[PDB]
Amino acid sequence: MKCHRCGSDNVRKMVDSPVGDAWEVYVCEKCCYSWRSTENPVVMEKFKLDDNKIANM
């Protein structure tokens, strides 16, 4: 599993769904992007991040 915004492999599971086994929340340690297991995030080309772009911030 890789980050949908910066492509990093450093993805950590944030939390499990408090009730039941419905979903999980994943977060990238490199760029702070988070998303849910049940959603299919497609990041717009203009919103993707790169090391060259994070360095500029």
Partner: protein, 471 residues
């Protein structure tokens, strides 16, 4: 009407047909966001939407609480069909009416202390967090009142977007908090934390006060007492920090602190002009304790292309003090409608003392602390025109505006970057539009006599409203 918490206000909305209850379980994304957008899209009388069950979460969500003129009027304790102009007048009457200090209550009397979480802090175990817009950087808390400071009456309360970064960590733009702007240097220079409080699910007027433009210096609990026509609000000391006081009725209270010397990607997120913001490095807050009411309600806000809820939260909040500033120096001004994109568009209704005076009123607005950098389009109409009735303003534009002489364009004026059409960025080319009737010594190409309303019109307005209340 006075509200001690969010729950009585939701009750009032439900009794008035201004709140829809969603009983079937919904998914966090995109059901809640889509329902907020649809509620905003219903036209008029837009209701708040209450989600009783969200898959995977234990508690409830309410959205679009402020997203209508009906909900706004009910927030002010008036009949839900009160006109926008009349709501503006009520707000102006209450704006400076009373200096009233909030009453401090013991911890045992604050419903926001009913439950305490001290060690294994997990925001998802309390708030049903979801993604508000498709390209947001994460799950956001978009309608929180943040409290920052040795006095509980020199406290600052404001709204800031709160991005969830972890079960215990969150993001914030401390650059937009002056009280934190000064203390952040001294805190980060000694790696000493900076205390902070995040309140969720408040009495509608507290959220309103937290949204008031920071320049007007009305973001204190005392102003809430002013808005309630002199009735104070109850506050309780924070559990962990003795100088931070939070509303007693808040659904959820997040006591925490800014982590020193930490900066990380925050965003993107929606902003009131209707577009996504950029991702920028900002501050992070660790949550040390969570106090909440039994069965907490997550009051969250959707924002998208205007008009959505935030537009109502800012509308008269921007209009009234602009009107007070204009009125102090120019008594002919009747009303000021600055409800369009935080006052980028402004419609002033005034009496024209003599020829050309309308452009003078526009100049005064363009030299106020807020209108000078913000107001880009300023329309001036006659005193009998309702500046909150856009049909009437269109009538004034069509019958009184001669574009050869009544439309003035001025380059190289103070601007604001939030306007994407600026060129150069951050600079404004202002546009003044004089839509008032010529007054001597201005020549009038064709004088006309307006159809003045018949006698007894106001009495009949009240009568017809009473007759409609019986249906």
């Amino acid at each position: 009407k006075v509200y001690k918490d969010l729950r009585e206000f939701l009750e009032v909305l439900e009794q008035e047909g201004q709140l829809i209850r969603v009983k079937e379980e919904v998914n966090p994304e995109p059901d809640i966001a889509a329902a907020g957008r649809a509620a905003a899209n219903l036209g008029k009388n837009q209701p708040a939407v209450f989600f009783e069950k969200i898959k995977g979460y234990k508690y409830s969500v309410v959205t679009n609480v402020h997203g209508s003129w009906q909900n706004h009027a009910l927030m002010l304790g008036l009949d839900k069909n009160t006109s926008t102009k009349d709501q503006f007048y009520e707000l102006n009457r209450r704006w400076d009416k009373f200096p009233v200090p909030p009453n401090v209550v013991k911890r045992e009397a604050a419903p926001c202390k009913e439950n305490v979480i001290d060690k294994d802090i997990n925001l998802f175990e309390i708030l049903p967090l979801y993604r508000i817009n498709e390209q947001d950087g994460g799950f956001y808390i978009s309608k929180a009142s943040v409290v920052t400071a040795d006095d509980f009456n020199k406290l600052n309360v404001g709204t800031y977007r709160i991005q969830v970064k972890d079960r215990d960590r969150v993001g914030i733009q401390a650059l937009a908090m002056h009280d934190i702007a000064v203390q952040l240097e001294k805190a980060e220079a000694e790696n000493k934390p900076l205390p902070i409080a995040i309140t969720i699910g408040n009495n509608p007027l507290v959220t309103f006060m937290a949204s008031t433009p920071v320049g007007y210096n009305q973001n204190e609990y005392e102003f809430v007492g002013a808005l309630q026509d002199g009735v104070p609000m109850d506050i309780v000391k924070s559990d962990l920090y003795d100088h931070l006081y939070v509303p007693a009725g808040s659904e959820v209270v997040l006591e925490g602190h800014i982590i020193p010397r930490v900066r990380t990607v925050e965003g993107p997120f929606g902003e009131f002009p209707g577009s996504y913001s950029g991702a920028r490095l900002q501050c992070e807050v660790k949550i040390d304790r969570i106090t909440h009411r039994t069965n907490p309600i997550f009051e969250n806000l959707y924002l998208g292309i205007p008009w959505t809820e935030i537009d109502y939260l800012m509308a008269l909040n921007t209009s009234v003090p602009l009107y007070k500033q204009l009125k102090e120096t120019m008594p002919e001004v009747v009303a000021v409608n600055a409800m369009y994109t935080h006052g980028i568009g402004v419609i002033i209704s005034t009496k024209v003392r003599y020829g050309g005076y309308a452009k003078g009123v526009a100049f005064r607005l363009l030299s106020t602390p807020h209108g000078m950098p913000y107001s880009k389009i300023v329309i001036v109409v006659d005193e009998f025109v309702d500046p909150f009735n856009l049909e009437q303003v269109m009538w004034a534009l069509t019958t009184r505006v001669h574009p050869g002489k009544d439309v003035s364009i001025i380059e190289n004026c103070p601007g604001m970057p939030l306007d994407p059409s600026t060129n150069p960025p951050g600079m404004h080319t202002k546009m003044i539009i004089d839509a008032t009737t010529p007054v001597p010594p201005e020549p009038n190409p064709r004088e006309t006599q307006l159809l003045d309303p018949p006698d007894g019109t106001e009495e009949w307005e009240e009568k017809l409203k009473e007759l409609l209340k019986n249906q």
